[PDB]
Amino acid sequence: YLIRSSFNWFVFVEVPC
Amino acid sequence: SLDLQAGLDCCCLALQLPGLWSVVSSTEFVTHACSLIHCVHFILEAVAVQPGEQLLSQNPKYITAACEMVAEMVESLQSVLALGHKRNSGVPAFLTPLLRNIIISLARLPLVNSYTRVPPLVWKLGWSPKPGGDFGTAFPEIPVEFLQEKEVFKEFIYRINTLGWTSRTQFEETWATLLGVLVRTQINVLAVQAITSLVLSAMTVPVAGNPA
Amino acid sequence: XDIWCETNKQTGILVLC
Amino acid sequence: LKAFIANLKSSSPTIRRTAAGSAVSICQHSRRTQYFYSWLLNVLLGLLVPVEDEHSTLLILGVLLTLRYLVPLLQQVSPSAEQLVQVYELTLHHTQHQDHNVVTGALELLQQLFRTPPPELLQTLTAVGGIGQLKPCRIKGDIGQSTDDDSAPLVHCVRLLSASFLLTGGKNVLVPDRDVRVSVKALALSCVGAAVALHPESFFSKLYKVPLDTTEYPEEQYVSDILNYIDHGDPQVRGATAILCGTLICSILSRSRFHVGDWMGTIRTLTGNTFSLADCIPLLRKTLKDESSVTCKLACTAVRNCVMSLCSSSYSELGLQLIIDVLTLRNSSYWLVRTELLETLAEIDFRLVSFLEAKAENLHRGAHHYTGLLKLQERVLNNVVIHLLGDEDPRVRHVAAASLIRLVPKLFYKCDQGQADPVVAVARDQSSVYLKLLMHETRIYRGYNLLPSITDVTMENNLSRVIAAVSHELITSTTRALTFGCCEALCLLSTAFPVCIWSLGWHCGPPLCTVGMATMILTLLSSAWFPLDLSAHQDALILAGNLLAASAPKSLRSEEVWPALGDRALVPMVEQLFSHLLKVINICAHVLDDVAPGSLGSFYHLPSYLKLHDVLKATHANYKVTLDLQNSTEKFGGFLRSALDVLSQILELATLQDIGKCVEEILGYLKSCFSREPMMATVCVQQLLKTLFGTNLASQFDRPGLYHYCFMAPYTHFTQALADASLIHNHIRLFEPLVIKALKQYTTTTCVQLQKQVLDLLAQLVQLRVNYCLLDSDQVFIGFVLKQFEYIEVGQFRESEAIIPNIFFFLVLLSYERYHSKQIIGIPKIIQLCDGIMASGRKAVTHAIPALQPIVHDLFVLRGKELETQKEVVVSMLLRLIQYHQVLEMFILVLQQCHKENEDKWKRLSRQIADIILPMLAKQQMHIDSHEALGVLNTLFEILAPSSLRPVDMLLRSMFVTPNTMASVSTVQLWISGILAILRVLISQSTEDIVLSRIQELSFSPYLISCTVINRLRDGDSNLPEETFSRFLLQLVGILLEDIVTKQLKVEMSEQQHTFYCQELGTLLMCLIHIFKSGMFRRITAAATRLFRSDGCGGSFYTLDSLNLRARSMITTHPALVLLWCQILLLVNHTDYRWWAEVQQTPKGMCNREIVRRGALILFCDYVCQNLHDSEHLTWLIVNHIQDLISLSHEPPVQDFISAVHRNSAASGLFIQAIQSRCENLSTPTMLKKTLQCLEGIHLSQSGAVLTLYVDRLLCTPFRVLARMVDILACRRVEM
Amino acid sequence: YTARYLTLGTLHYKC
Amino acid sequence: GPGEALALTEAARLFLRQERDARQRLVCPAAYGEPLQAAASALGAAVRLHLELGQPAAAAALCLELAAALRDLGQPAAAAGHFQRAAQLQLPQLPLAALQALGEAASCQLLARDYTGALAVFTRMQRLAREHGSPAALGAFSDVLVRCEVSRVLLLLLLQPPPAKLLPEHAQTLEKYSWEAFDSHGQESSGQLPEELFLLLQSLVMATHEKDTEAIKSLQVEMWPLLTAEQNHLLHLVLQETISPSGQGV
């Protein structure tokens, strides 16, 4: 999936699926 | 919204450049100039004017329609296209400066400019000369006896300040017109302000006398 | 006009109790 | 009368006008008004009735004019139908006269005959053979005759008017204006409109009944060619043609019950007319754009007549098109066009407009492909109604303020807690009247309220938005006119929606009950110009007093100035208003005394108040030299009245340390103001006594939806009610001159409102313990009041209805103890006055009942053998009037008081009342043809001792009765009302086996109201017990349905009668639902289930299919009653798709059809949840109604149906297959959301099927919030 | 032209 | 006192009509604003006078008249300042009037391209509307909350504040339109907004999380009928800053 980046509220990052 | 902006940015910029202007300001392009006027009026009403409201408070009939549409749009610059005015609240602020600049530039086309310079109150007073030129739309300049009417003179001043002048000939004709009002204190004050605005309009840098 | 006038009778006085 | 009839032959039009007016006026103010109208009508027709004799043209004009002034007084011995048809026939004769001044007088008379038809003439002119059952002439063929049997007289009348004045007989030709003058053409077009209002099919006639010669006339001409007068040169003729269109559109939509295609199809087969109802709308549209303002005013009146019926019809888009096209008239130069637009817009229901706007797509685009919405409510509210509060004409501002008040109840807004959509908003409106329950059960000034008000949230929200908008325009006001119009609007809003009741609507924030914008209104009355407009100023004072009164029960305490104010932020506002009031009342005191200006009321040193003195001095100077004594708009009196009223209001917040330094100054002002406004000055003296004596408030303090509104809330309120059915003063000498002035004024005046107030003052003075025998020196005033009864009894005292209750309250007080020198009056004498006014006078409900109400409240609540004797005499007076519901309310009181004092007296009196009431009900002698009266009777039957009703025989013998006739609505309503009153007793105070055994032992027949009995009673020609009872109720349903559907809307019944039929049917159907749904009436339920399946025993009884044909006709007009019928059909297991596919509009607009469509599906879902052992109705809902189930999935019964589908594998499979065959209509954001909320719980054995639907159809959308929800649900199904 | 009424008789008008 | 104040309102409106003739009715190129300078000095003395007379609502009326004039005359930054001075003078006594004035200041900051300033005025309004108008609001304050919600979400999608400037109120507002966890649907509506507008805002806030520009372009044409023209300008700026970011010099 995507998840929210922790360093910026508007940035999202992928996690393995 | 990016596509309305792309088409209207192109129309705005193409009419600002003298080499593109002189193509559309020509007899060969009359049907193209009429399309620009029809399309801009149509886009403006489709965005700004709700059903049951109005925008304000021989030659083919499309030519006469173009003159009326540009005259109504040049009137709308006080009201519907005045940025942040109480009647602009139906137009999104990104369309307003484009539509202003386009309308001022379309009103300078030879096709419509003579018609658009006439204060609408003089048609109501019943003036009706036979036009004659390249397009069948070249009216005379307004008789100075109408410019003794305070409202007709304010409405004339609005149109000459808004459109500017398209040639040395037109500057000299509006100069001769305004001098003819000096030869009541209120029309002297209006003519002193109008002649000041006219001569100062020569000081505009890239192209003198073109407000757009 | 009134009946006190018209029958020549004096009007009353108010007092508590 | 003979002295004025003699002048009807005069050459002078003026002498004839004086004679005609004087003659009818003398009759109108006589004692025997109906006898003198009949005598005058004898004389007037006597002057012309030998019609073969040539009469004087002057006399014809004088008599036609006198009849024209008389016919509005006949609208209601008495005038007969035969005499009234002679007026009509004589009018038709004089339209063919040579002199067209007589034709004008006859058409003007005919216009009053159709504008205000006398009821016997109205029945005659609309009936199918109604009269037959008892320069030169232009008519060139057979137009029928007035006496024909094949058609109603109005068909002939419209032909005559058309052929005389409008149509030549040749198609599309207008009659020349030299052949008939345009004044006569306008009168003739408007007489046709007034006839079409009564009988629409008169418009569809071929002009000639037998053709003219086919050589000169090759095509037949229709009457509908009069719509060619829309293009005529004269403005009044064009406008009269637009008025004809509006009346024609409205009347077709009322005479057809919005079933236009059926009604038009019948008329097209009878006449051959290709004409359409839609053909009128472009004629209204072109005439709103007329060059003449008079034509434009008339086209606006035409839209006001038809816009709402268009919006309710299958032509509802043309309704929106007309609302759009009138908005341009806001910019009109003519003030009468502006006010007609404001009156037009005030008729519109914006809930219905919001429904229509939501269904519209292409209509939002107009002629020019517009982007965005119509926003009609926002444009009407802001750009017309609130915009015209700024109008320079005060007449337009006044109309705009009134139109705004009519709009607040009709506004719709999204996200409201009471109504999530406009179909729910229209449904709750339509249910609110017909499903109203049958129920019943030191004075503070206006604008105060101590009890918790239980307000409607939707109305508080609508009011909040309106007050915010009008307050914004008041803040940003750049013009004096807009400031004035916003103050008038807020003042009137604060009257129509009182601030102390609607405190959340009036909440701007300041006290965190409310004070709204009080500081904003107080800024105006300190400003230099606003006080000098007396109208805007009196509106500011009234609004300021109302806003400061509405704080009270949260601003009251228990500092040294204004001690009762605990909210000390309000004390500046109150001191500002109070000192202002004393200054402006002192200005009036100076102006009324003529004393030149030169301490709180002192103003001689303030320039703003000296300007106000000179405005008021000028307004009073014009009054001194004029005599318009009825004029209510006189601005000095109006201003002074409002000042004294607002002072009287603010004195509820005052106590003796506020007023004690100040009272002698206020009484000095009131002494000067008293001669100009005696009544409001007396009210101020009463409040000023309540402040001195500690008797005022300052000294005497300490989610819903369609299932809910159409069924569940009415039902729950009804079932709960049936369950409950089984259970320092030295200052007094300052007031003496003003009290003596009030006493004197009572003995000189004829103003009953002054006299009523002086009695209220004396009643308050005896309660405040003033010595009456020193105030009334020798019983002079009481002697004068007793002398007034002689004139009141004989009917010589004009407005005595207003004075009676205050005299009886004053006499009742003055009787107490043996106080003062002697007892002034006794209860025995008060009983003799009351039996005097009861004996032989005018109507009880205005005279004897208002006299009883004080005496009954004293002797049974507040006041021993002499007393008990007088109480028994009052009960014998009440039993003489028991037919009136106001004395049943007095019987509820005496029963509630004897139930507490002595149970054996309560049992005896309850038997005595029931033994009188039940015979009266059996004979229709009770005045119960009203919702309030039926509710009072229902309450009396709960308050009677239950031993009074114990053997049900007397109830049954009073219920199982026929009326003397069914030819009149009043008789049918009284009869059904008595049955509904008794049926409620049987189903709440008795049990099925008690009632059914007593029915069998009394041998009642089901044939008591068979169709043969009903049919003869409509002409006026006077075996189980469960089957007997069920037939009786199921026959009454058919009677009510027939009378609601068939009876013509204004001809045969009043508007009050039409709603009471619907309320009777709502009450009846709610009883049948309690019988079949409670389980407490199991034998009656089984019998009704058998009866609904039967043939009519041949022709003897109404069948289910005949009851359904009437109920199906009600869909377009009474959707709340049709939904109760749907509920009964499911309770008797009638599940035939010949009903359900019609009401649910099953595939193979009108708002009332949508209410029934949704309500029917919801009710059917509530049924199948109780029938899950049956597969067919589960499958049928899914296969045919999947979209509607998903749209309605928030309604509790449809939610339960969807949860039942989730528990069944095959049903969940059909649900997925049905979504898969409609997913293209589900693709809209709100519908896809609802679809996925349904699919989330789908059965475990269908997980591959629903997953296949997700990836194939639902996963690929621009709506990212929904594509994420599909992804999550799809992942859960692979995990499953 | 000829008319007929109930309370009035049968009457004639000059076309 | 009140007569002197009245005369100053008329004497200010004289210069202000004179300015409107030169600027708006004649469109004079030589119209340097000597009458506007005289009108602003005249009302400066009159506001001082109404506040010494202790009647803030009558001073706020002058501030609204001058603010409206400066907006019409093409100076929205000067208008936004005078609208906030009117709001501050109204707020202790007339909360709805103050919200109306702050709404016009926010429109003026948007005309002046001062989007971070507009964002802060909408947050002040949404606080004051909950504080005086209440979790359901009364109908007049509810229409203000609905404006502030939609405007703040589009302003936050335009500006995208760092964690240092994502205030608790901004984070709390945005999370209603966002997902907390990988299997969350996103939150359900509290009934503040129409369901269709709420679903389109959630879709927009989610399309900017997953960088779906084709979805943002589709949602822009779909939301056009539902928004005010001011909000359609905000949503245009979100799609414009998405495709052609500011601050790169290109």
User: What value, to the nearest 5°, has the Cα angle with vertex D316 and ends D311 and D320?
Assistant: 80
- Chain centroid to Cα B9, Å, comes to 19
CB of D977 closer than 8 Å to CB of D929: yes
DSSP state at residue D374: -
Chain D contact probe: residue of C1, C2, C6 with most D CBs at under 10 A = C2
Tokens representing F77 are: 């930054």
Q: How far is CA D785 from the centre of its chain?
A: 38
Half-sphere exposure of D230 (CA within 13 A, CB side): 23
Beta-bridge partner residues of D556 = D565
Q: Which residues contact D213 (CB under 8 A, 6 or more apart)?
A: none
> CB-based contact (8 Å) between A17 and chain F?
no
Both tokens of F147, joined, read: 């404006």
Provide the β-strand partners of residue E4: E10
The two tokens of residue D142 are 């057979």
Our CA-based measurement puts residue D976 at a distance from the nearest CA of chain F, in whole angstroms, of 44
Q: Is D478 helix (H, G, I), strand (E, B) or coil?
A: coil
D744 pairs with which residues across the strands?
none
Residue given tokens 């004293």 in the structure block:
D858
Contacts of D608 in chain F (CB under 8 A): 2-3
CB contact under 8 A, E13 and D52: no
Interface check B92 vs F, CB under 8 A: yes
Chain D interface residues (partner E, CB cutoff 8 A)? 49, 51-52, 82, 85-86, 89-90, 92-93, 96, 98, 131-132, 134, 136-140, 145-147
- Among F18, F20, F21, F26, the strongest candidate for a mutation testing the B interface, having the largest count of B CBs within 10 A, is F26
Nearest residue to D480 (alpha-carbon basis) of D440, D517, D522, D535: D535
Phi (first) and psi of residue D805, to 5 degrees: -65, -35
> In the C/D pair of chains, how many CB contacts fall below 8 A?
52
Q: Return the residue matching tokens 């030149």.
A: D596
Rounded distance between C-alpha atoms, residue D1212 and residue D1203, angstroms: 10
Residues of chain D with Cβ-Cβ distance to F3 below 8 Å are: 528, 607-608
Residue of D398, D458, D698 lying closest to D571 (CA atoms): D698
Of the partner residues E4, E9, E15, the one whose CB lies closest to the CB of residue D52: E9
The runs of H, that is alpha helices, within D1192-1253 are 1196-1206, 1209-1220, 1223-1226, 1229-1239, 1247-1253
Number of other CB atoms surrounding residue D568 within 10 Å:
12
Distance of CA D524 to the CA centre of its chain: 36
Question: What is the rounded CA–CA span in Å between residue F43 and residue F47?
Answer: 6
**What's the CA gap between D1247 and F142, in Å, rounded?**
43
DSSP SS3 for D1024: coil
Which one, of D685, D682, D840, D693, lies nearest residue D757 by Cα? D682
Angle at D867 between CA D863 and CA D871, to 5 degrees: 90
DSSP-derived secondary structure letter, D176: P
Instruction: Show which subunits contact C, needing at least 3 CB pairs below 8 angstroms.
Output: D
Q: What is the CA radius of gyration of chain E?
A: 8
If one counts every other C-beta atom within 10 angstroms of the C-beta of residue D503, the result is: 21
User: Number of residue pairs across D and E with CB atoms under 8 Å?
Assistant: 54
* Closest alpha carbon to D712 in D947, D334, D1016, D428: D428
- Nearest-10 Cα torsion for B176, B178, B181, B184: -160
Chains that touch D (3 or more CB pairs under 8 A): B, C, E, F
D290 phi-psi bin (left φ>0, alpha ψ -120 to 50, beta other): beta
State the smallest CA–CA distance between residue C8 and chain D in angstroms.
Answer: 11
Tell me the two tokens of residue F84: 């906030």
Task: Check CB contact of B91 with chain F, cutoff 8 Å.
Answer: yes
CB D741 within 8 A of CB D674: yes
DSSP for chain B, written as a single string = -HHHHHHHHHHHHHHHSHHHHHHHTSGGGHHHHHHHHHHHHHHHHHHH--TT--S-----HHHHHHHHHHHHHHHHTTTTSSTTSTT-TTS-TTTHHHHHHHHHHHTTSHHHHHHHHS-HHHHHTT------SSSS--PPPPPTTGGGSHHHHHHHHHHHHHH--SSHHHHHHHHHHHHHHH--HHHHHHHHHHHHHHHHGGG-SSSTT---
Residue D254: CA count within 13 A, CB half-sphere: 21
- Cβ pair D139:E11 closer than 8 A: no
Backbone φ and ψ for D216, nearest 5 degrees, come out as -80, -30
Task: For D739, name the nearest residue in chain C, comparing CA atoms only.
Answer: C14
Residue D1134's Cβ-count burial label (10 Å; 0-12, 13-18, 19+) is middle
Residue D1159 three-state SS? helix
Handedness of CA D708, D712, D715, D721 (dihedral sign): negative
| Alpha-carbon distances of D1167 from D487, D726, D1199, rounded to whole Å | 55, 30, 13
Spatial CB neighbours of D661, under 8 Å, sequence gap ≥ 6: none
CB contact under 8 A, F25 and B78: yes
CA atoms within 13 A on the CB side of D1161: 27
How far does E1 lie from chain D, in Å, by closest CA? 7
Q: Which two tokens stand for residue D193?
A: 């409109």
Distance between CA atoms of residues D351 and D426, nearest Å: 6
The count of residues in chain A is 17
- DSSP class of residue D946 equals G
Q: List, in order, residues 6 or more apart from D1062 with CB less than 8 Å away.
A: D433, D434, D1044, D1118, D1121
CA atoms of B95 and B1, how far apart (whole Å): 9
| Backbone conformation region of residue D516, classed left if phi is above 0, alpha if psi is from -120 to 50, else beta | left
Q: Which two tokens stand for residue D503?
A: 């405190």
CB-based contact D607:F3 (threshold 8 Å): yes
Half-sphere exposure of residue D605: CA atoms within 13 angstroms, side-chain side: 4
Strand A12-14 versus strand E2-4 pairing type: unpaired
The yes-or-no reply on E/D contact (3 CB pairs or more, < 8 Å) is: yes
What's this structure's resolution in Å?
2.1
Tokens representing B156 are 């004339």
Question: Parallel, antiparallel, or unpaired for β E2-4 and A2-4?
Answer: unpaired
D1269/F contact by beta carbon, under 8 A:
yes
| Contact assessment for residue D182 and residue D189, using Cβ atoms and an 8 Å cutoff | no
User: Is D784 close to C11, i.e. CB distance below 8 A?
Assistant: no
Distance CA D238, CA D245 (A): 11
Distance between CA atoms of residues D830 and D838, nearest Å: 12
F185 and chain B: CB distance < 8 Å anywhere?
Answer: no
F48 contacts: CB under 8 Å, gap ≥ 6: none
Q: Does A8 touch chain F (CB under 8 A)?
A: yes
Do residue B92 and residue F107 have CB atoms under 8 angstroms apart? no
What contacts D194, CB < 8 A, 6 or more positions away? Answer: D110, D111, D114, D115, D247
Preferred mutation among C4, C14, C16, C17 to probe D, highest tally of D CBs within 10 A: C14
Q: Hey, what amino acid is at F200?
A: L
CA distance F2 to F5: 5
**Do residues D1144 and D1189 lie in contact, with contact meaning Cβ atoms separated by under 8 Å?**
no
* DSSP helix/strand/coil, D1103: coil
DSSP H or E run through D346: helix D335-347
* CB contact set of D946 (below 8 Å; sequence gap of 6+): D989
Q: Collect all residues of chain A within an 8 Å Cβ-Cβ radius of residue F208.
A: 10
Strand partners, A3: A13
Q: Are D1226 and D1235 in contact (CB under 8 A)?
A: yes
Rounded to an integer, what distance in angstroms lies between the CA atom of residue D103 and that of residue D110? Answer: 10
User: How many CA atoms lie less than 13 Å away from D189 in the CB half-sphere?
Assistant: 31
D222, β-bridge pairs: D206
D134 contacts on E by Cβ (under 8 Å): 6
CA distance D1008 to D1181: 41
With beta carbons less than 8 A apart as the criterion, state whether F59 and F47 touch: yes
Put simply, the answer to whether F163 touches A9 (Cβ < 8 Å) is yes
A1 min Cα distance to partner chain F (Å) = 7
CA D299 from chain centre, in angstroms, equals 26
DSSP string, F152-220: HHHHHHHH---TTT--HHHHHHHHTTS-SSTT---PPP-SSS-HHHHHHHHHHHHHHHTT-HHHHHHHH
CA separation for the pair D507, F138 (Å, rounded) = 8
Residue count of chain D, please give it: 1280
Nearest to F108 by CA among D836, D434, D1153, B93: B93
Could you tell me which chains touch chain B, where touching means 3 or more CB pairs under 8 A? D, F
Dist CA D404 CA D1115 (whole Å): 32
Chains in touch with F (≥3 Cβ pairs < 8 A): A, B, D
Name the one residue in this structure whose structure tokens are 């709805």: F96
Tell me the C-alpha distance between D770 and B171, whole Å.
95
Smallest Cβ–Cβ distance between B49 and the set D325, D363, D370 belongs to: D370
Does residue D471 sit at the F interface (CB-CB below 8 Å)? yes
Q: Which of D1031, D1027, D942 is nearest to D987 (CA)?
A: D942
Geometric angle at alpha carbon D1246, from D1245 and D1250, rounded to 5°: 155
Let me know if chains F and C touch, i.e. at least 3 Cβ pairs under 8 angstroms: no
Q: How many CA atoms, within 13 angstroms, populate the side-chain half-sphere of residue D1013? A: 17
DSSP string covering D756-802: HHHHHHHHHHHHTTB-HHHHSTTSHHHHHHHHHHHHHHTT-STTTTT
Please spell the DSSP secondary structure of F113-139, one letter per residue: T-HHHHHHHHHHHHHHHHHHH--PPPH
Encoded amino acid at D659, one letter: I
| Closest chain F residue by Cα to residue A17 | F182
C-beta atoms of D1266 and F203 within 8 A: yes
Query: Does E13 contact D136 at a Cβ distance shorter than 8 Å?
Result: yes
Q: Which residue has the tokens 């004629």?
A: D283
CA distances from D472 to D386, D901, F61, F140, F211 (A): 11, 60, 11, 11, 42
Handedness of CA D1020, D1023, D1027, D1029 (dihedral sign): positive
Contact F29 B197 (CB under 8 A): yes
- Among D362, D300, D351, which residue's Cα sits nearest to residue D330? D300
> Using a CB-CB distance cutoff of 8 angstroms, which residues of chain D are in contact with residue E7?
49, 82, 85-86, 89
Cβ neighbours of D939 (radius 10 Å): 18
Residue F176: closest CA among chain D residues belongs to which residue?
D1265
Measured distance CA(D317)–CA(D73) in Å, rounded: 41
DSSP string covering D649-673: HHGGG--HHHHTTTHHHHHHHHHHH
Q: Which residues contact D432 (CB under 8 A, 6 or more apart)?
A: none
- Show the DSSP H helices in D725-751 as ranges: 736-746
Closest of F126, F56, F42, F114 to residue F85, by C-alpha: F56
B51/chain D closest Cα distance in angstroms: 5
CA distance D785 to chain C (A): 12
Torsion of CA F209, F210, F212, F217, to 10 degrees: -20
DSSP string, D97-165: -SSHHHHHHHHHHHHHHHHS--HHHHHHHHSTTTTTT-------S----TT-SSS-HHHHHHHHHHHHH
Burial of D633 (0-12, 13-18, 19+ CB in 10 A): exposed
**DSSP of D568-587:** TTSHHHHHHHHHHHHHHHHH
Lookup result for tokens 């405007």: F151
